[PDB]
Amino acid sequence: GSHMYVIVVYDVNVERVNRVHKLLKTYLFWRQNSVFEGELSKAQLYELEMRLKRIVKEDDSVLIYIFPGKNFDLHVVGRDKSPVEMII
Amino acid sequence: SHMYVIVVYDVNVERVNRVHKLLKTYLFWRQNSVFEGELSKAQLYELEMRLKRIVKEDDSVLIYIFPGKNFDLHVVGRDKSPVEMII
Numbered sequence: 001g002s003h004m005y006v007i008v009v010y011d012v013n014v015e016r017v018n019r020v021h022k023l024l025k026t027y028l029f030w031r032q033n034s035v036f037e038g039e040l041s042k043a044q045l046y047e048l049e050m051r052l053k054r055i056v057k058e059d060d061s062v063l064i065y066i067f068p069g070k071n072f073d074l075h076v077v078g079r080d081k082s083p084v085e086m087i088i
Numbered sequence: 089s090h091m092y093v094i095v096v097y098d099v100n101v102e103r104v105n106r107v108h109k110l111l112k113t114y115l116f117w118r119q120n121s122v123f124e125g126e127l128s129k130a131q132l133y134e135l136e137m138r139l140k141r142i143v144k145e146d147d148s149v150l151i152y153i154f155p156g157k158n159f160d161l162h163v164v165g166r167d168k169s170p171v172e173m174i175i
Contacts, residue, residue: 007152009096011120012165033098035150052164062164063122065094075151077136078143 001041005067008036012060019055020062023048032081039070092154093132095123099147106142107149110135118161119168126157 008028012020021034027048028036040048045066052062076082095115099107108117114135115123127135132153139149 007094009122032148032150035096049162049164056165060165061120061168063118064162064164065159066162067159071155073153075136075153077139077149077151078147081148 001043003039003041003069004045005070006037006040006045007065007067009063009065010034010036010061012056012062013058016055016057016060020052020060023051023055032076090126090128090156091132092157093124093127094152094154096150096152097121097123097148099143099149100145103142103144103147107139107147110138110142119163119166 006028008024010020010024011034021030024030024036027040027044028038031037045064049064056062093115095111097104097107097111098121111117111123114127114131115125118124132151136151143149
């Protein structure tokens with residue numbers, strides 16, 4: 001299967017925040033506050049988008065950035081909630 | 089020497105206007121708290137330094153640095169950026 005990398009930023013109303021967050025945790029890695037990322041197949045990306053589309057209503061927003069692969073660096077300014085691992 | 093960046097901020101309302109105004113000088117506001125655009129490394133280092141002197145107290149700015157603009161964006165829900173006529 002052809003594979004992509006995605007970065008998802010959502011902006012949804014507070015009544016819907018738990019349904020969007022639980023749905024995104026099934027497919028993707030929780031980075032921080034409202035940002036999810038990870039590898040997805042194309043059937044899985046279309047399934048996530050369809051299930052997101054049935055949740056979002058009424059000026060809710062989900063940004064899905066679709067990449068051919070994981071060729072990036074991430075730098076965090078401020079609080080990094082992601083735990084630090086020991087690399088020898 | 090040149091990169092594409094995607095910036096997502098999570099800042100308290102006391103400092104939010106200062107983070108938004110600074111990111112608007114360097115980058116394009118996509119929508120809600122996401123900025124993106126091209127930057128040189130001198131500009132990315134300067135933006136990050138000025139961001140570091142603003143954030144306090146569990147404020148967070150995610151800066152994703154890419155070698156170029158090789159991606160698509162799909163939006164679910166409200167698209168704030170207007171759609172243009174391409175003929």
